[PDB]
Design a protein around this ligand. Sequence first.
Ligand SMILES: COC(=O)c1ccc(OC)c(Nc2ncnc(Nc3ccccc3S(=O)(=O)C(C)C)n2)c1
Ligand SMILES: COC(=O)c1ccc(OC)c(Nc2ncnc(Nc3ccccc3S(=O)(=O)C(C)C)n2)c1
Ligand SMILES: N[C@@H](CCCC[NH3+])C(=O)O
Ligand SMILES: N[C@@H](CCCC[NH3+])C(=O)O
Lengths: 489, 479
Amino acid sequence: VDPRLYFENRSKFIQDQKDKGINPYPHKFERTISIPEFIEKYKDLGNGEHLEDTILNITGRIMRVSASGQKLRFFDLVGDGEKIQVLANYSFHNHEKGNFAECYDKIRRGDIVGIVGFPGKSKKGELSIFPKETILLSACLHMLPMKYGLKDTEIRYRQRYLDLLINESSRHTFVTRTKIINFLRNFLNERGFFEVETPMMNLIAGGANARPFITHHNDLDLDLYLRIATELPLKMLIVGGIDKVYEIGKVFRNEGIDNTHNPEFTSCEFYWAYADYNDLIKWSEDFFSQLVYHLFGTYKISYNKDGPENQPIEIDFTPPYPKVSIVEEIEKVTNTILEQPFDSNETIEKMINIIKEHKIELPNPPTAAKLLDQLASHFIENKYNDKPFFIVEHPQIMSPLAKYHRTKPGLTERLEMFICGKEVLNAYTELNDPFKQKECFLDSAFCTSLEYGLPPTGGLGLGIDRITMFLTNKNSIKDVILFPTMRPA
Amino acid sequence: VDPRLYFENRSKFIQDQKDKGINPYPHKFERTISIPEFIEKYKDLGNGEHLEDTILNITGRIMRVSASGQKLRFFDLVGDGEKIQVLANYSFHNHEKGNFAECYDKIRRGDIVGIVGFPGKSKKGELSIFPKETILLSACLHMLPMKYTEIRYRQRYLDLLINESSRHTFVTRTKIINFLRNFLNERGFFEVETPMMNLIARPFITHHNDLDLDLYLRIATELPLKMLIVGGIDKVYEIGKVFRNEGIDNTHNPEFTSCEFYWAYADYNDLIKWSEDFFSQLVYHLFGTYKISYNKDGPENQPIEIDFTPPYPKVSIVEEIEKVTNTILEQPFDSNETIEKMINIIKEHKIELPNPPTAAKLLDQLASHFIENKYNDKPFFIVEHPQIMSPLAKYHRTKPGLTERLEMFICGKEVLNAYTELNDPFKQKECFDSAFCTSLEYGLPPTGGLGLGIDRITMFLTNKNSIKDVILFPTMRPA
Ligand SMILES: COC(=O)c1ccc(OC)c(Nc2ncnc(Nc3ccccc3S(=O)(=O)C(C)C)n2)c1
Ligand SMILES: COC(=O)c1ccc(OC)c(Nc2ncnc(Nc3ccccc3S(=O)(=O)C(C)C)n2)c1
Ligand SMILES: N[C@@H](CCCC[NH3+])C(=O)O
Ligand SMILES: N[C@@H](CCCC[NH3+])C(=O)O
């Protein structure tokens, strides 16, 4: 019952073994079949059918120990997410290698073993390996949580291996996460896009609005910023003639941690020459509907927005998705005209007064771009929760790198897609006129590259961790990152 | 002639066009076919053959400007690394949309243009696009050079536009990583992401504000991946950036791309076989052969042939030093006698003494000058390094003081490092990271782990002598 006592006893057991000549951590084991291959090959045997002439070397982790007398031992063996039974019968044991009871009394839950034996099914129909010999390969010195015991704690996020061993759902979640990225990489590659890597470290951190991380470069004797986005170097590659380009990799933002914000997270940003806003809308609807159907065989999924203790909701990913113009909707909802320029003193005061009258938290500093973001969050960002939708046509002052709207003054051809009130996608027609970049006349290198001619371009960015959360029914981003950022305890 | 005046003149042209009601940066051109698709579908056209009844919308970048008389204007149009010619002929100019000379007088080398026209070949046989209308999509305000050395690194877009061997170099790099991803995926490996920032060579140090604690950029992915082996991901790998805050040279960058995999129940021969399978097939997948040419000493000097036909030689580091230097290195290798011996061979050859003169560094120095260039004929492995050079590698089964470590070399440059894991916690001297020793106590199976230097591999497979030439935006000293 005392985990400390269990550990010291197991430590003494390990030393007891090796001063008896037996190496409890042997060098190699010539495994011949894996547990998933074993299940695939022998799922068809009848109950009680033994294949005694087929000798297999199989490895796994013991997860359950029981017996029926000293001459019959039963175990669960797991590997690669799959499970078989171990049925050790005294009469099938290779007695030359050692005493049968001595061999199997040592096995504890969590032990990694290598088994030489034959496949079969028991009379109870459970597929089993029937050992002639089992060898300890790596002992589990600790009492593994007793199943359904890691259910909720910080041990899952720190000792993630325990989480993957005990909780069957977690492995499926991270398998789904890799299937998302594989689908996204295949989706883009099928359409001619070219994957690249751009520096994790730059003298500026552009391409988004976020506080960066600062680190020191010893060789260059210079302070660099961890990238907050891949946007600027990617658009420079468009200038270089890589007309379809993208990058899936980590970005860093040094701000508040919560259930949808992790200091480092995975983004996909692609840039698509000679495409525009309308292509990006079509791309987003094509990708999400195809991705959801790929994983589920349907466009409708369940998501526990208000936790697992409340009824879920249905998110329907059947395209098209609704589009809402941010300034128009805010003006309609608040019955107030936001007069241009949006960053005028009057309009800033008018936006604050709306925020004051509705008791919406005033952002710091109350800049026009942030005030508009707060009004959008409070008034439109939770309009649709049964389906995803786009907030579109953001003002130029919120979109410094987006092309000016081709018919609506003061706006851009920008789109953000939201699922259950969370942004997962940001895209727009790319501003390619160097003289219209207010920051030009901010990277000197990027602004200069614009002067060599950036073709009309559409670009898009994705939040992969947030996408994985909805597609795996998780309310916290820590549950889709293998080792989330954590305080030291 | 003066670049500053050219940029000033071109900038004024953009403003002059705006005042005239023309937008020099239009929002959307509905392209109908790409340049490579265009070359594919009309390469077999007859000379002088037109197809007037097929109108096509095409985009590209003007890379050359010329004119025959004044009613025929000749251009080079490049896109996706491929080129056609623009045949602007006054007869096929749609005058309803603008003056012929007015349109084509403005076009400068580097302009991104959109073209409405038909496909055909000229009399001389050069496949051409014949515009009815040509629209400026995005203008090149500077003069594009023709030849240009450090502009390549600071303005990679110019390199990608001008050199046409830079584009091949970085297409090869992506193909290398794609092959590696698919190679591991077909073998049942599972790709994951582990943190770049931890509480852990010299590190890069950053600070999170709200948490108010320092974080360190990972130097490798070894530790979290091995923890995932404990967690039951028996075949796991990650491809991504790692950071070592040291000096820059042709084969070391502080930020570089690594692949690490860990493979439960793999033994030493499994790791050797994986390496020989991967490198031989990757080379063959790229070139249709196992033998490549590589300029070891730059393009000025002679090139050598590297044969990637498996199997590769295996060399034991200690026994090979002993044979080449004609001494014996008695164990423990960190005894005052053997260290002083190794110091004395270093002095006798006037090789640089590593600071500090620790046993592992001296052994690395001896390997570098006596072993690591044993073969430039082919890749080869330096194997079975002492335990004191590899604190995480399992002990050798039969040879005292050694491990089952393997290190693969191309032209004296390390590109691969692997070994079987020391999974017994009571033999791990670090135990007696606390997060790692704890994970060992829950049971790490016998496992093989391998790491790959993607940048160095791409260098050799694109005939490059500097890591700067395979990184799109190498980190440069600013002004
Ligand atoms: C300041 O601004 C930030 O963004 C920010 C700040 C701090 C953070 O941690 C501490 C994160 N960390 C994160 N963690 C997972 N996801 C995302 N995404 C995301 C977040 C906000 C808006 C839009 C998006 S998004 O996914 O549409 C975009 C990537 C296309 N951010 C983001
Ligand atoms: C052990 O290294 C280091 O302490 C180190 C120190 C400084 C560096 O920059 C400043 C790098 N940066 C780098 N840049 C490109 N390539 C590589 N490779 C590489 C380098 C040395 C040994 C082995 C390899 S390797 O290709 O076998 C791969 C398995 C790591 N390292 C590595
Ligand atoms: N860089 C943007 C995504 C791409 C926007 C289109 N250029 C972001 O971080 O939100
Ligand atoms: N992390 C090692 C490669 C894998 C080591 C084997 N477990 C390196 O950077 O050289």
